[PDB]
Subunit: 292 residues, 2 copies
Amino acid sequence: SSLHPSIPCPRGHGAQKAALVLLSACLVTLWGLRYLVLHLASLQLGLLLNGVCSLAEELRHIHSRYRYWRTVRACLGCPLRRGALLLLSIYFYFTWMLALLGLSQALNILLGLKGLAPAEISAVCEKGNFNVAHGLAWSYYIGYLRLILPELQARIRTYNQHYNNLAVSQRLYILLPLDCGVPDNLSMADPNIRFLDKLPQYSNSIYELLGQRAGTCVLEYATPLQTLFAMSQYSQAGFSREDRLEQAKLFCRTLEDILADAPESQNNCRLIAYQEPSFSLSQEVLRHLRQE
Amino acid sequence: SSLHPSIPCPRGHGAQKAALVLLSACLVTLWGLRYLVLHLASLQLGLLLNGVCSLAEELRHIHSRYRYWRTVRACLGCPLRRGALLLLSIYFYFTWMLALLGLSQALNILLGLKGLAPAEISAVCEKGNFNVAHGLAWSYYIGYLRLILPELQARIRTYNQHYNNLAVSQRLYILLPLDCGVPDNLSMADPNIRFLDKLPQYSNSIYELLGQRAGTCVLEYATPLQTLFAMSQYSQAGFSREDRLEQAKLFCRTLEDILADAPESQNNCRLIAYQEPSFSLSQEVLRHLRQE
């Protein structure tokens, strides 16, 4: 780190080299077979059973996360290497071994052997530097919404006198396109959506909603979706559109869990997300206003 | 997920319950010992050796990451449970077993058994929702610096005519306090630092640097450190100040690696970080200007 000494360096090839050197030195020290086979076969059988136990939970998230082969290929990692090692173990090969092996796997799952080392958690979290979902949520909450949300219904009640007699719904409505393609103009997504007013006091937009003119909405896009899209159109990132969709979904759920527990943001903003494959933004927004 | 069906739900207690049920059903099926002991003792010995091999790499990051007992306690996790299991295995207990065990650990380290399942990577990354370091870096790069950095030396050469004859250094200098406490005024951190000018064209600040007046700096704080600090002063977060320091260091290194590979941002901005425990911002900045 050519900046400051207290800032740590990324993790290098330290464990592999010294580990191989020490564990080869012990081999040469003790240099000048069926227990080995049973041990490694039991190891791979336990790892495969652990993968099946993880797949038992990941069987639920099919339609919402993984859209079969891709699910198992993502949950067990590389099952080709595991199958090849299993065929080598069975070829170079006692049914009561399976009972104690299953009990060992049950004890390791329940008692929590699979709780990782915190150094491993750090090496996973600091890898690849594209884990962009929580910075956007906390920045969008602290930097924008926390400031604008206290005075919001006050300035709505300010505006309502000029439309009730001559109204505006009380909840702020945020659009969250999962395409991550955000135009500048909200009339450009639908001609039924027209600009009506700018709310006085920074930016706000009060809209009419359609010829059945029914809704008076306070509407706004979410901001960091454009940041995700510029990361997508940044060529040297190597940031795929599937990664964009993944981080968009995680951003949505994170912002939902933040607004679920906010003390001043309980019943004054509501999130609405959509995704195109026939479609209408206006019908979904009107469903939210009618259910309001 | 009460928002949209395609947004996935957090991972629940699915693996534990069904795994325990199935692995107890197999026990009751096969219901109506020293191999077990050797297998589990070999398991814990291999896990302990793997922890030592990880500690061999994590021995380097003492002064920069971990400031001994805390290092091992963070690298091996809970060694009390491992020691208790090791004493149970040795109590309820062949030196040539150690050679094959070490060779098994060497093969598992080198060939890459410890490459995790991608579902495990997802469950680690989606846990706890305080991994706030990359959203801030990419938002601060795309949203602010990418726009302001092309025209920067042009407007510096615009300004230089009024001070060379009557200068301004060419690199933008960013302060990065690791305290994450950012005052509004840069003269409030040091009376030697005085406001000289606002650079015409959004915000910019050209400063004199001290009675030995020597430096003409274009100076600015980094923005999301205030976001980190407001996360620190948010009471319901449970966000400790050590977590704040950790995410600040990771933010610094991430922004450094982004600016290392930027195509238009090669030699026009330089990062400077500092940390208080006698101190001077001005002396460190002047060292950077003299080495310039």
